[PDB]
Design a binder for these strands. Sequence first.
DNA 1: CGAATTCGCG
DNA 2: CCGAATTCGC
Length: 580
Amino acid sequence: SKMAFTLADRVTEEMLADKAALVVEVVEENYHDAPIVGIAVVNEHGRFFLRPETALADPQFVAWLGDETKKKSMFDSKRAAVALKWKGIELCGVSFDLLLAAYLLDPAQGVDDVAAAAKMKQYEAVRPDEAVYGKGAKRAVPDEPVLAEHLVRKAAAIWELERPFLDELRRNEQDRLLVELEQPLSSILAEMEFAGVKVDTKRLEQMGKELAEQLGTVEQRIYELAGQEFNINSPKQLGVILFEKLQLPVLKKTKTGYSTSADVLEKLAPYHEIVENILHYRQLGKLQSTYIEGLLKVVRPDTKKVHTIFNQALTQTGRLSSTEPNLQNIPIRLEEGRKIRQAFVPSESDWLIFAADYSQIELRVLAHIAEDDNLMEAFRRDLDIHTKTAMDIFQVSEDEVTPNMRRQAKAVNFGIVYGISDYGLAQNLNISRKEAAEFIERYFESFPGVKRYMENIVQEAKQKGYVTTLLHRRRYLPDITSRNFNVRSFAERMAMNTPIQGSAADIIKKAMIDLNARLKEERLQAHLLLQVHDELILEAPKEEMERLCRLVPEVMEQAVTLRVPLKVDYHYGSTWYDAK
DNA sequence: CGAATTCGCG
DNA sequence: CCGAATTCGC
Ligand code: NA
Ligand code: NA
């Protein structure tokens, strides 16, 4: 089968062409401070494999790596770039990233190596990474001959696949989306990950001790209320205790057995004192195992920072996801969990954390996209959207809106930006579905523009096969035509929701790029640390706070121009917690 | 090792 | 409408 290449033992001029497919291979899943196991270059002059100890010590090669006028095509350039940052080497001039290109063409493909991306264009002369490296325990770097040929075949595939991928992006009007949004974002994310977020480990350990005391006693409480010891963390054992030893009523099931989810438990609370205690235990136990212990496990003892990996090509909506640690689900809603954010601190003395977030970006996008007159006016008035929605669907004045009316209108708003559900709304408010349905319908006569939009987008998904965001991100919806009701329903919701959630994703991505540019133009030391779907988190010298208070919201509000304002709130403080 | 369950965020 | 921790059957 054998692909021919040069197994180079030193860098030559012809390897430094100003157009090349480049592979800088990091086999470790978590690429932070990870080995680079080999390098492949394919250009007009040939195909090359270089050992990294040689390549990365060659001044000419390193200068080439960092020369922006030397264009590279790659796959997961962020992976390579971060790995090089940790070695003090800058990667530049990446003009095409095959992973991001695949992602934009079809985020449902699940492309996670060069092979998977190559298959989209009938190119199969490259092996899947799994086949070469193995899976799980037996994952391993193979001897040099196998390694080098694998990396050269990936480089060769990248070299061949650029043009067909760019052609399709162009036909999709997604060329600018790749070149001007996702790829520049990828460098910014690479900076963010490398910078990391400093963690006060002493505070976490302290909070851990406080948890363990409480846990230890709630645990003991549960045992005497059950008159038995058992694993409270096993939903099956818990199910036996609750529903068999303590003959509690079964109000919901899982397919494996009894449901012990928190929504059920709340309903069981009037029956036995053990239910509130299990609930506490769950709350405290979640914080202990995931946010205390989980977090301390991934803080790097060298930097005392956590270095997340943002997955830029994973979600079907265009959102990022965040791993090891996941910094997009740090507690905020309940106070004792919110206290976790006290452990996230600036990375230097007399710096502060700065957080800015969009207020209701999704509903604002819906207003713009549906051109709903009522919804648009509400935001031009900067109304409380939940109170307005309560006024409208209950046909009452502002003074007549009760907290509970507001809470239900809130829930409809939540559900509306996730494509109603009829039944799902019912679950959230525990009402009946007929009840839930006529809230939904009362919504649609308050907002005929949104109704019209929901109907229009569903027909469009049917006729085209996909739906589109503001900046031309795509999601294919094959199930929109399915004869199975449930399946067809999910697809319909996605058709409604994806232009909403996806356009919000577009906007905050552009904002990140606009921000990064402005900060550098202003020569500020401030830099991005994290993004949480609708929220940007920075750190900077305390001396830069007042400028940032104007700069960051301006950038975020002006990222796109919609038929309604975008509104951004901001706070800063000594810790992430205090930035509220 | 991997399906299932629960819960955290948006 | 994402990811981490845990359990459990294998
Ligand atoms: Na040569
Ligand atoms: Na890479």
